[PDB]
Amino acid sequence: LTCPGAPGDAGLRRFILHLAKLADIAGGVDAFLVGTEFRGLSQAWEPQ
Amino acid sequence: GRRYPFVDALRDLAQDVDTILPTAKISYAADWSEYHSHQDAGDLTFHLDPLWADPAIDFVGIDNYLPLSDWRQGADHLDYDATSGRTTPYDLDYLKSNIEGGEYWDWFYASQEDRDTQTRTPISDGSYGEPWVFRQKAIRDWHANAHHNRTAGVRATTSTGWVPGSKPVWFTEYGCPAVDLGANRPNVFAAASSSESALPWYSSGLRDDFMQRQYLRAMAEWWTANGAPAVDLANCQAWAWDARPFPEFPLRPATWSDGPDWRLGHWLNGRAGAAPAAEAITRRAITRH
Amino acid sequence: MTDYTDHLATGCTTLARCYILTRRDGVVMGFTDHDRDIDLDGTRCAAGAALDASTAARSLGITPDDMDAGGALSADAITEADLRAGRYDGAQVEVWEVNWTDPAVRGRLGVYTIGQVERGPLAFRAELRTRPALWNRPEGRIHTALCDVDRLGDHRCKLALGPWQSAATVIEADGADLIVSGLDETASNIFDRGVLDWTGGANAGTGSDIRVARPVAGGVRVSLWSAPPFPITAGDTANATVGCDRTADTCRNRFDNLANFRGFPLM
Amino acid sequence: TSTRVGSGKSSQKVKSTNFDYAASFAVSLGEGPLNGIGRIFLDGQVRDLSEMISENRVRFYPGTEDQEPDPLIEAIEGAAPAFRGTAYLVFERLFLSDFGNRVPQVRVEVFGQSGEMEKGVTGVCVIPGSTEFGYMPAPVRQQSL
């Protein structure tokens, strides 16, 4: 599962999608997770 | 306005995963405080995710290491056996009662000094006619009632997770630490400078499998006790199991922790599962004797 | 009896403890300590002579305690023939402490089982052993050779039961060798090692093991392992039971319970 | 088996016969249902699993009270020895032959029914610690670094 495309894609989105791709290669998975505890990220102060 | 970027990105990500696999159910595990509202100035708006409410995410989950009871109650905790007539140093009912009553809902510690003095301070609201709604403790309650946002302190009518019956809660992670005590800190996992490495404040050096027994099964019983088992009882995954460590027999269960893991280098009570002697004696008496 | 403890503190307490006893038969005799009979919690306790002996032996089950209460024999409460029969033996007695001053509060001081009985011409003494002592007896769980079909109809044994069991009446009473009727010649020798529960009479379904069953004229003559307790009248209703030798071949021939044979014929 | 003396006597004496007494020894550790059969060996803690799957996949019987089938050990006898509720491990026709007439006692580690807390729990995270090939069921033969 080498990924070409764009180098910038690598990171969390790539990781999750790559794992999903692995699950697809297997066929199906009963459940998936996103972030086990990204608390600091979850509290990202934003000004709108 | 405060739209956290990570959450917005998560919503987009959830759609993508669903496209790749319809079968996969996407859940974001969260801290107990995160599950409700993490208290903050201007971030008091509920941290309950609009994404959890959103269809693209298919499940709601908690990495929950919230204390069933807090060990730092001094005499009032598990050192109350002589004074309160408590039967055992490790008492299942007492911890279970503490979570049910409101551990960290009315049992939060205002200061480090409070932990040092072994006293828990109650937290309540009632300003809006609602009790503290950011209670770390409430999970079944959190599912039972949709929780309205509380932006900048001021209450907001709109509720994240507007439908109370949201996607079923998942007990993605839970359990006591390898060491003795640790009811106060169940998020302790051995490491270096990271947050998990720090030990419970007054936990004993000796490891306790019984403390894990105090969590695990009792916690499951507590969830059954909860009126709605929103948490995925079937998928109540505990923190540790492994193949390589202590391989006298590939992480054999009836051992306290370390075995011939010396080549690898390991320190975990949790992966191995202990067998309680007292219960076995009682059944044996009924049939064998 | 919580109030009784309070009564003890006041000192205004008159003891009315009643020694209710349930035997294997289950008949209950109040045998109340209080001289005036008191009915407590729906149980009438007559003022039969109380069993009082020496000093209380009390350990909380760490040591099994047999309480040697000595009770003057009361004909109504106890019968020697029944004691010999053993219907009385195996009796379980619960001592419930009550206050004459207060009928409402009754608490069980202890639960004990009569074990050793010594009789006298006009009086008797009995040992009220605690439940741990009976529990302490060791079965041992030995497994070797013969099948555990054993006693037929045991749940682990899972015997078919059904057709082999038969109904019989006694043509003659000869103690151990009583001749019986209603039993087929075929039934004899299949009922060997069997039991002969006697529905009729005091036994009421209690049967001495049949040591040997041999068909004879006038119906099969049954030789029991032991003489039946109590005199058995001829014509008493009886239930005839098959006897399992427990030899693996015998178990197989008679019932063939391969699913439940604890047999290890070849080692 | 005999050895040739070549020209002086008979050169055809040599034979390659295997050791005898291969049998379905069955060891019943205990009565009642049993689980977690592991770390079993006649002379030591264990034998290579990858190398040996024994006979019919290391046949063992848990101890089911209702019925226990016979893998040709009680089956050959027929109608009298089917076991019930006995935890017997059947080793059949697997004589290693390194040993002689005697066969070393085999100690098998088994779990007696217990672990009520373990029974209650439904899940444990399967793999917190992951290696380069982490979850591979087959042994990953490794070329030397």
What can you tell me about this protein's structure?
Chain D: This is Tail protein. Chain C: This is Gene transfer agent. This is part of a larger assembly, with three copies of chain A and one copy of chain C (267 residues). With 48 residues, chain A is mainly alpha-helical. Chain A has two helices and one strand. The N and C termini of chain A lie far apart (40 Å). The chains are: A mainly alpha (48), C mainly beta (267). Chain A binds chain B through residues 13, 16-17, 20-21, 23-24, 28-39, 41-48, and chain B through 1-7, 9-10, 13-14, 16-17, 20-21, 23-31, 34, 38, 40, 42-43, 47, 57, 59, 61, 63, 172-173, 235.
Helix content of chain A: 25-40%
Strand content of chain A: under 5%
**Total E-strand runs of chain A:** 1
Q: How many strands, what sense, and barrel or not for the largest sheet of chain C?
A: 6 strands, antiparallel
Strand residues, percent of chain C: 25-35%
Keywords, please?
part of a larger assembly; 4 chains; A: 48 residues; mainly alpha; 2 helices; flat; C: 267 residues; mainly beta; six-stranded antiparallel beta sheet; five-stranded antiparallel beta sheet; 10% helix; 27% strand; elongated
Topology:
The structure is cut from a larger assembly and holds three copies of chain A and one copy of chain C (267 residues).
Chain A (H helix, E strand, L loop, with lengths): L11 H15 L5 E2 L5 H4 L6
Chain C lengths: L1 H9 L7 E5 L5 E2 L8 E3 L2 E3 L20 E7 L7 H6 L6 E7 L7 E14 L3 E7 L1 H6 L29 E4 L25 E4 L7 E9 L6 E4 L12 E4 L7 H7 L13
